[PDB]
Amino acid sequence: ELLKPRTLADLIRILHELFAGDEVNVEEVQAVLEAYESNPAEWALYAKFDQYRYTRNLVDQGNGKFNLMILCWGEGHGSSIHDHTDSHCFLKLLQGNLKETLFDWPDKKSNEMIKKSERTLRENQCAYINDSIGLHRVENVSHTEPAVSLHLYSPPFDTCHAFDQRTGHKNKVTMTFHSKFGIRTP
Ligand SMILES: [Fe+2]
């Protein structure tokens, strides 16, 4: 039974229920994420920005079934074109806007990567990606508004690949956290 999450903490409780089993109902997870109305006071603890690039701030480890984190994007900050390591990846905007660009998996031949489509994700919207859908890049293209997003990955993963837009070549990246449970990482 899917109910509206009243707060971020309630959302987390609901997610624990939805991930209690071995599979994931993507549409249900997306619907509950979308139903949570961002409340900046509830997530201020996690919204730790860096001058130079976006930050990843761990919120919950999902009893091992998922990682829930908050990403903080300064003006002009963006990601690589990347995959999601055979995991489900949900992204919900909590503040601002992000541009998501979709790309196809590269051919083995070196070529300029093919941009499929683009969209602007607005406050409170929840998007979904997985490797079967394709690759993506996420960027805060704003000059004036920092963005904050809530990401859920299941199973958790700590490495992925970044892809060179000019060639399709991939490199393994290890993801790092800026903070965990509100506490800065050393
Ligand atoms: Fe992503």
Residue 35 burial by Cβ neighbours in a 10 Å radius (0-12, 13-18, 19+): middle
Q: How far apart are CA 62 and CA 40, in angstroms?
A: 22
Contact 96, 76 (CB under 8 A): no
Q: Name the residue type at position 6.
A: R
Ligand 1 centre to CA of 4 (Å) is 25
What is the number of domains present in the chain?
1
Which own/partner contact pairs does 1-5 have at CB distance under 8 Å and 24+ positions apart?
Answer: 2/28, 2/31, 2/32, 2/35, 4/35, 4/36, 5/32, 5/35, 5/36
Resolution in A: 1.4
Q: How far apart are CA 76 and CA 80, in angstroms?
A: 13
Ligand 1 centre to CA of 84 (Å) is 6
Q: Is 178 among the annotated ligand-binding positions? A: no
Ligand 1 centre to CA of 131 (Å) is 10
Q: Is 169 among the annotated ligand-binding positions? A: no
Secondary structure (H, E, C), 154-170: ECCCCEEEEECCCCCCE
Phi, psi at residue 67, to the nearest 5°? Answer: -110, 130
What letter does residue 105 receive in the DSSP assignment?
Answer: P
Domain, as residue range, for 56: 1-186
